[PDB]
Write a protein that binds this DNA or RNA. Structure first.
Ligand SMILES: [Zn+2]
Ligand SMILES: [Zn+2]
Ligand SMILES: [Zn+2]
Lengths: 134, 54, 176, 309, 39, 37, 167, 85, 157, 66
RNA sequence: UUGAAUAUAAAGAAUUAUUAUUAUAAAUAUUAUUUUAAAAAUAUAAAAAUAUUGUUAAUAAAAUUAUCAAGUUUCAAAAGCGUUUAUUAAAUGCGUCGGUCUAAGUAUUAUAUUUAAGAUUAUUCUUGUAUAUAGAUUUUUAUUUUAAUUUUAUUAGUAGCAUAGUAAUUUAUUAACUGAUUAUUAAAGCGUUCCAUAGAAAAUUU
RNA sequence: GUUUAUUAUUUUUAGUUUAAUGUUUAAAUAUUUAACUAGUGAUGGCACAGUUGUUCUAUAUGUACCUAUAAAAAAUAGUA
């Protein structure tokens, strides 16, 4: 990851935070507040993709279903997430990796590397399963 | 098995999903070579516990 | 070349120099005789060799006794990397009476990481024979089944297993 | 004890000065007296190993290395003994690198800190107390008023109350000279140059210490020359003529007429006195040739100081 | 490790040897980093 | 025998050309604080 | 006047004054000038005269706990040549009881000092006081089961075994 | 030429079993079980070296003194036989 | 020497040191290579210092690890950086009281420093000195020339 | 330790030009602690300091984190 | 894991190459990359009678060995043991000595040098640099620097000694352009000389 | 590892003063080997940079020819 801050990336941030060349800024007090819209669009309308891998939760019973969570979801948030959104109430230990997003060459030829994610092997108490009738 | 510096052959590493063959991970073709990091830690690394002084 | 201050413990073998001297191993057993034989060689390690200069002043005498080791709690409190203004001893303590505890310097923790990886190595060998004391131990136990089942079979089929001749060449107990 | 200083002589040439009474190394390194520092080698501002620019007195001798060893014995020294509070010589410590002897004095109001050890001092005796006389006892630190003509004093302080600077080296002694000045006393420093020391200055009575250093200390062992470690002092006549004017020559070239270190050090030329103090009376050049005794005869006044230098 | 190339002038006259003293051409387009400061 | 021909020496010669942010931080009037006037 | 009079010390190790200073003076008979020279000791001390086995009434000198008979190399068996006194054979120590008893760290360079049936570190047992080493504190560098002690002591011809040439 | 936990034996080793040379596993007769033997010393060779007599390396001065105790002074028992049958 | 075995290299290799990073920090800043404006000198380390060194001016035992051997003895005494000036506040010792305060407060802080020096020379050279040692030089016969010690002996006492 | 804007906590993920030389030496070099174990970066895939979850609190000795 | 966070197999010589990357830790895994029917050279040498240097610029410091891998002795020349890009009377280094320095470091000290330790001694004489100097130059020699052309006394001397030469004598060898000895005017060694001298390089004997 | 009364000192000494092989070689220095080997004073924290650093001094080296690299020129080359 390139640490060096680019000029444009701040300008592209403002124009969507508040209409930058046209609408004057919100006073710095509001920007330091949990009522600033991107801190308000977050505290009430989260944007997360906790996708579940099924290859470990399929017909084979499992006590350790595996997820993928965005790289910036820490453990105790994955608890809060499954607890308050998917009613999951039995999580004693979570086990978290970080994986370089999948890479490949498209038929054209550019290396189209997907975004990176974060395997988080949660460990439920009573095992869970999924049925697949053929 | 343990978290040691080692030399692996490249075919052993398993290839990406090829047109001829699915993604053959290094594990599902060599199960008994998956490192067991419980067995590593239990044996080779020093636990916070054993030196906790305060 | 990987300055020694980087290694957790300074390296065991210490390579030098000397275009006209070719030997890997540092000559120990000479660095040992000096030091054991001559008291002065190694700096006094202040405390165990202070505590005089503090007995002489307060008692009017030479201490004339073995100085306690393990510097008293409260000595060398501003020092940070003592390790020389001491023996390799730890920074003694606070000025407290709590039970002695090793201040877990990065060094002490490494020694813990050895005495666990020493017990690790001596354990991977101690039982590589314990099972080698089954494989060959049980291979023999089984091999003698073979020479028994061969021993039983070689009597009914009468193959004396002693050449083309009859035992009359054996009974002579010559070569023949 | 025979001869409180010995030329111990481990090898027939290697003669180091052991003194019976010398404290064993264990009773040497004292915590609140031990200083450690890296000494800059000869590197001065911009690394750049180099001496001093011609006019200055801050020494970075080009040929210097390993000045502070790191686990060498390094206790700090007092140099300011107090006037007439009794001492008590607890031990006599001998550091090789700082060739000085120095013994720990209790000093009778607890101060286990005093070092400079005058010649013929014994341990476990009280020193700073005067006998019936004015203050004529070996080790007694005497103001220059209290000395009489012709008796040695060491660790004389140059400016009164500013610590002893003159005659600190082993066996050295500044001899009084009986001057005529109103409130000043001239001392024949060992450099054969006389100096109008203020009479209120403090000096320690006696010789300095450790006689038999002037000679009789000869290492001649590769390990033992680490009492004085210094850089190699190369020939100036094998120095890559591009570098040093004395150089090359297909054989042993004797050397150039005017010797020079890098700038100039011609043999008796470079005399580098640039500022003479108001106290200075006759520099070492004005006396270098007379004798030790003839300089002890005259009386010294302001008219003896030569108006031109 | 570094070098100013100018050589440290006396502490009293801080600047001897400007690069102009040598009839130097230092256009920004010629050698790049040129344009002097005393200007 | 140099070292580190690998990829980190292949990025650190390409990503560091990225021009950092510039903010003309003008000099702070330490000794003459203007707001205490 | 062969000129290069300062030289390389080219011919050491090729001398007869050398051949006598290279020998080892071990516990054998091997009159002299017959012991091994370069490694200083012969490999495989044959000991057919006395079998040199680990005893049954064996115990740690430092710790005193009984020692596994022979199935293991957990014990550091120092047979000090012919010892007899420490045990039927020489001192015995589990690898972890091989520390100095008084100072409790390792026995540096492995020379120990049997103080009243508890191996003491030579430096402490000698009165010196520098009491912590650098490398490994509480475990010595020693070899196990005499494998480090077979550089010395009792090679094959211990005593006058002239039974060999006599009738 | 090989000993034991407490005993001895003797055997000439080939090239094929050079692996088992240092420490073998064998039936220790001063016991009734297989027990690990060692290699207390050499007792010759398994074949000839080129251009050399039958005893090219020679057993030892040592393994001979082991032999001179086994066969050696049998004077306790020339009775019950000497070499005959 | 004609054989460079080149195996005595390769042991304990050096860190990678990624010198492009310092090469970048130059450009990502106005400065060139820090031309001999500094060029450098070897900075001190924390180990070679000796805190509790009875020098150090007793205010600086952490800031003095930095600073040269030639400059740390002279580093000046300043303050704990939280010690406030002596403040002419009104808090009088709990039991010193008035009459004493009314008298003492009359004396100013050179009228009291002066009294203190006389008393201290009087406390020393009193029970303290007359009890054992002597602190005033004696004459021919051995009579104490000056009444009380000289102002220097007291200063260093 | 990246940190949330609102959180008063201070983390060492700086991006000032004076601080990136060390923030890369954490991501590519990693730290070799003097205790023998390699810290923050010990293997192959170098971390992404800007996709870390935010620093939640300073560590304590008794528990892990206050 | 019960730590939040964080990340765990793979190098460098251009290569999958000479190549144990020795930070550590011990010590019996029956761990697993090497074509093939010949004699020349050559790399190389198991084996084997005599002879022992007659080979050669010159034998002898010249791999391993279970037959267990080691030449002895005398003389002459030659210091320190460290350290060097064509590896040594190279350059270091202790002492002595010369000079400098009492407002940054202790004038039996530290700068700045010349030598070399140890043991004997350390000679004759000065035209210039330096010092001192007096408006400066020009003049000017207590010590120091450099010098001595017949300095040349001590001392060794055909010697790493400008030719003359294989020096003339003596030995030594069957044969002495070797080497050592005596003395001794050595093209112009020379007092820092000379002796003493150990593993080196020579010369013998063996 | 070791000789010696000796903490000094002989010296086990598998990476290095020699020799063979190699000679676009497995190597823009490797294989075998002689020698040497005792470093409480040193492969090594960071520090000095190009009319210059460093130099136990060899005009040696300061990134695999020190003539530093890198960069910028139209130097001169008709005077076989
Ligand atoms: Zn035990
Ligand atoms: Zn102990
Ligand atoms: Zn048995």
């Amino acid at each position: 990851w390139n640490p060096i801050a680019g000029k444009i990336g701040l300008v592209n941030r403002k124009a969507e935070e508040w209409g930058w060349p046209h609408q004057r800024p919100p006073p710095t007090g509001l920007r330091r507040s949990p009522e600033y819209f991107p801190f308000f669009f977050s505290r009430y309308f989260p944007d997360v993709e906790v996708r579940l891998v099924l290859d470990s939760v399929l017909n084979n019973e499992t006590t350790r279903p595996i997820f993928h969570i965005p790289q910036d979801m820490s453990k105790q948030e994955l608890v809060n997430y499954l607890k308050n959104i998917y009613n999951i109430d039995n999580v004693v230990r979570i086990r978290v990796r970080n994986m370089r997003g999948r890479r490949f060459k498209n038929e054209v030829g550019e290396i189209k590397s997907l975004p990176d994610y974060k395997v988080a092997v949660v460990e439920l108490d009573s095992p869970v399963s999924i049925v697949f009738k053929q | 098995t343990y978290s040691m510096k080692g030399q692996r052959y490249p075919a052993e590493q398993g290839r990406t999903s090829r047109p001829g063959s699915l993604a053959a991970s290094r594990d599902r073709m060599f199960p008994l070579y998956r490192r067991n990091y419980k067995l590593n830690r239990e044996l080779r690394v020093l636990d916070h516990r054993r030196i906790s002084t305060d | 070349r990987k300055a020694l201050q980087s290694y957790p413990v300074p390296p065991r073998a210490r390579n030098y120099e000397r275009r006209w001297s070719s030997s890997r191993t540092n000559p120990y057993n000479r660095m040992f005789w000096r030091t054991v034989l001559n008291e002065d060689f190694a700096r006094p390690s202040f405390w165990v060799s202070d505590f005089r200069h503090k007995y002489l002043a307060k008692h009017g005498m030479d201490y004339q006794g073995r100085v306690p080791a393990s510097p008293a709690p409260g000595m060398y409190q501003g020092f940070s990397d003592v390790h020389k203004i001491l023996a390799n001893h730890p920074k003694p303590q606070r000025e407290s009476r709590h039970l002695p505890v090793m201040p877990m310097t990065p060094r002490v923790v490494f020694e813990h990481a050895q005495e666990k990886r020493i017990d690790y190595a001596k354990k991977m060998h101690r039982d590589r024979r314990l099972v080698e004391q089954l494989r060959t131990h049980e291979f023999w136990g089984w091999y003698m089944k073979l020479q028994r089942v061969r021993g039983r079979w070689c009597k009914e089929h009468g193959v004396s297993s002693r050449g083309v001749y009859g035992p009359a060449v054996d009974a002579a107990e010559l070569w023949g | 004890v025979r001869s409180p200083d010995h030329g111990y002589s481990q090898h027939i040439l290697q003669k180091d000065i052991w003194s019976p009474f010398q404290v064993g190394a264990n009773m040497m390194s004292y915590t609140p007296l031990y200083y450690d520092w890296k000494g800059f080698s000869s590197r001065d501002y911009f690394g750049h190993r180099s001496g001093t620019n011609p006019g200055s007195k801050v020494l970075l001798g080009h040929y210097r290395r390993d000045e502070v060893r790191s686990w060498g014995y390094r206790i700090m020294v007092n140099h300011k003994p107090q006037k007439r509070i009794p001492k008590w010589l607890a031990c006599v410590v001998h550091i090789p690198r700082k060739k000085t002897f120095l013994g720990f004095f209790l000093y009778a109001n607890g101060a286990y800190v005093a070092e400079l050890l005058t010649y013929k001092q014994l341990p476990r005796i009280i020193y700073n107390k005067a006998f019936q006389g004015c203050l004529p006892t070996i080790g007694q630190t005497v103001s220059l008023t209290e000395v009489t003509y012709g008796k040695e004093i060491h660790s004389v302080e140059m400016y009164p109350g500013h610590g002893g600077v003159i005659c600190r080296a082993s066996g050295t002694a500044a001899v009084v000279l009986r001057g005529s000045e109103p409130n000043l006393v001239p001392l024949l420093l060992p450099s054969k140059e006389v100096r109008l020391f203020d009479n209120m200055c403090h000096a320690v009575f006696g010789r300095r210490a450790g006689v038999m250093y002037n000679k009789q200390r000869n290492f001649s062992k590769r390990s033992v020359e680490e009492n004085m470690p210094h850089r190699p002092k190369v020939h100036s006549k094998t120095k890559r003529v591009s570098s040093h004017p004395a150089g090359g020559g297909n054989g042993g070239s004797p050397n150039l007429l005017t010797p020079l270190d890098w700038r100039i050090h011609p043999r008796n030329c470079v005399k580098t006195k640039y500022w003479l103090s108001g106290y200075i009376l006759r520099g070492r050049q004005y006396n270098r040739n007379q004798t030790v005794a003839d300089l002890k005869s005259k009386t010294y006044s302001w008219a003896n100081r030569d108006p031109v230098y | 490790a570094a070098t100013p190339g100018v050589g440290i002038a006396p502490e009293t006259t801080p600047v001897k040897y400007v690069p102009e003293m040598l009839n130097i051409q230092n256009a920004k387009w010629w050698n790049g980093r040129g344009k002097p400061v005393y200007r | 025998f140099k070292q580190g021909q690998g990829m980190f020496s292949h990025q650190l010669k390409r990503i560091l050309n990225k021009k950092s942010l510039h903010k003309y931080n003008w000099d702070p009037l330490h000794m003459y604080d203007p707001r205490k006037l | 006047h062969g000129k290069p009079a300062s030289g390389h010390k080219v011919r050491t190790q090729h001398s007869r004054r050398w051949w006598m200073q290279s020998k080892a003076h071990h516990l054998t008979a091997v009159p002299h000038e017959e012991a091994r020279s370069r490694p200083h000791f012969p490999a495989y001390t044959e000991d057919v005269d006395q079998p040199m086995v680990v005893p049954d009434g064996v115990c740690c000198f430092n710790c005193d706990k009984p020692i596994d008979g022979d199935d293991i190399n957990s014990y550091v068996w120092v047979p000090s040549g012919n010892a007899r006194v420490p045990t039927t054979q020489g001192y015995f120590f589990h690898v972890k009881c091989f520390k100095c008893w008084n100072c409790k760290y390792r026995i540096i360079h492995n020379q120990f000092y049997s103080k009243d049936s508890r191996a003491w570190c030579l430096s402490c047992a000698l009165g010196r006081d520098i009491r912590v080493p650098t490398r490994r504190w509480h475990t010595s560098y020693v070899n196990t089961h005499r494998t480090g002690s077979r550089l010395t002591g009792q090679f094959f011809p211990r005593h006058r075994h002239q039974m060999e040439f006599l009738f | 030429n090989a000993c034991h936990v407490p005993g001895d034996q003797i055997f000439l080793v080939s090239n094929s079993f050079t692996r088992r040379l240092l420490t073998r596993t064998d039936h220790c007769p001063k016991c009734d079980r297989l027990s690990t033997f060692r290699f207390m010393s050499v007792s010759g060779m398994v074949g000839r070296m080129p251009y050399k007599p039958v005893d090219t390396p020679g057993p030892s001065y040592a393994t001979l003194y082991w032999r001179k105790q086994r066969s050696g002074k049998i004077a306790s028992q020339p009775l019950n036989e000497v070499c005959n049958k | 020497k004609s054989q460079h075995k080149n195996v005595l290299r390769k042991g304990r290799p050096h860190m990678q040191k990624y010198k492009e990073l310092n090469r970048w920090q130059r450009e990502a800043q106005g400065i060139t290579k820090w031309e001999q404006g500094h060029s450098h000198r070897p900075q001190p380390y924390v180990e070679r210092f000796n805190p509790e060194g009875a020098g150090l001016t007793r205010g600086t035992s952490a800031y003095a690890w930095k600073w040269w051997h030639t400059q740390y003895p002279w580093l000046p005494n300043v303050a704990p950086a939280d010690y406030v000036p002596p403040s002419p506040r009104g808090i009088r010792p709990a039991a010193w009281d008035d009459e004493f305060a009314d008298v003492v407060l009359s004396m100013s802080d050179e009228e009291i420093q002066s009294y203190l020096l006389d008393k201290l020379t009087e406390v020393i050279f009193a029970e303290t000195q007359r009890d054992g040692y002597e602190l005033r030089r004696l004459d021919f016969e051995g009579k104490p020339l000056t009444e009380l010690p000289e102002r220097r002996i007291i200063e260093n006492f | 330790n990246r940190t949330h804007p609102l959180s008063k906590l201070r983390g060492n993920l700086r991006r000032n030009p004076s601080e990136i030389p060390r923030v890369l030496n954490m991501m590519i070099q990693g730290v070799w602690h003097k205790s023998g174990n390699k810290l923050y970066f010990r293997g192959g895939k170098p971390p992404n300091p800007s996709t870390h979850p935010y620093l939640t609190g300073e560590p304590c000795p008794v528990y892990g984190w206050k």
